[PDB]
Scaffold this active site. Structure first.
Site, PDB file in Angstrom:
ATOM      1  N   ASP A   1       0.868  -1.166   0.000  1.00 37.62           N
ATOM      2  CA  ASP A   1       0.000   0.000   0.000  1.00 37.62           C
ATOM      3  C   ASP A   1       0.909   1.222   0.000  1.00 37.62           C
ATOM      4  OD1 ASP A   1      -1.839  -2.070   0.636  1.00 37.62           O
ATOM      5  OD2 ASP A   1      -3.026  -0.751   1.966  1.00 37.62           O
TER       6      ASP A   1
ATOM      7  N   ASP B   1     -16.002  -3.913   0.981  1.00 43.10           N
ATOM      8  CA  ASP B   1     -15.494  -3.564   2.301  1.00 43.10           C
ATOM      9  C   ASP B   1     -16.675  -3.634   3.249  1.00 43.10           C
ATOM     10  OD1 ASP B   1     -13.104  -2.990   0.941  1.00 43.10           O
ATOM     11  OD2 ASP B   1     -12.889  -0.970   1.737  1.00 43.10           O
TER      12      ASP B   1
END
Length: 235
Positions: free
Chosen positions: A10, A129
């Site tokens: 990330d 999510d």
């Protein structure tokens, strides 16, 4: 097949980072995202899961660096983060990544996401999510959305339990089992992995539809090595 492992990189402000609960500002930094990706590749990774968190949060982007990292990989790359319109999708595809993930776009602009699926097929997966049965985006019902995306031809889902992300408390296996029971498309597990036992538990769900697992903080915080992880999911 064996469980696929997708070690994560990330990126925020050009650094490799990990978040807690996906929250902007919770970053722990680990240095160079290029060096990290190359280390995973060297240890035998088949996949990189690469995320541009600046693009995800709308604070600029790391497009040149993400393109550099992707081009430096000899292995498959899944690229995510802020892919929400034609230009961000074009930028991502131009890295030469193997597939991209759409997240918020599936919630906020479902027709655009459906069109992307129709036009790019299995170069698209959709990130879900989840908290409980509620979808979150930077809302929606989990099973209604999954049903809609199935009917639109979505190839693959990346399922994150937000409450487990970056916490090293273990994956939400019940969430994953029930998404697999609701769709026939492959499911990639993301979030919470903390141990080799967690990977064994995920590997046991391959017959039910868990195709792979994205591994983040457990690798950066040295709970285990990628070499151990690859051995454990082998027969």
């Amino acid at each position: 097949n064996k469980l696929e492992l997708l070690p994560a990189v990330d990126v925020r402000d050009g650094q490799a980072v990990r978040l807690v609960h996906g929250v902007s500002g919770s970053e722990t930094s680990y240095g160079s995202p290029l060096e990290a990706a190359l280390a995973w590749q060297a240890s035998g990774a088949e996949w990189l899961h690469l995320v541009d968190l600046d693009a995800a949060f709308g604070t600029g982007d790391n497009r040149a660096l993400v393109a550099e990292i992707t081009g430096a990989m000899d292995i498959k790359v899944e690229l995510s983060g802020g892919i929400r319109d034609d230009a961000s999708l074009a930028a991502a595809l131009a890295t030469g990544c193997t597939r991209v993930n759409l997240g918020t776009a599936a919630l906020e602009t479902p027709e655009w996401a459906a069109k992307a699926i129709a036009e790019h097929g299995d170069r698209i997966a959709v990130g879900l999510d989840v908290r409980g049965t509620t979808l979150k985006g930077r809302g929606g019902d989990l099973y209604e959305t999954l049903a809609r995306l199935d009917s639109e031809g979505c190839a693959r889902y990346v399922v994150t339990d937000i409450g487990k992300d970056g916490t090293l408390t273990g994956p939400n296996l019940e969430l994953l089992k029930n998404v697999c029971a609701a769709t026939d498309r492959p499911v990639v597990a993301s979030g919470g992995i903390s141990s080799l036992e967690d990977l064994r538990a995920l590997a046991a769900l391959v017959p039910q539809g868990v195709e792979g697992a994205i591994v983040g903080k457990a690798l950066y915080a040295k709970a285990f090595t990628l070499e151990e992880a690859l051995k454990v999911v082998s027969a």
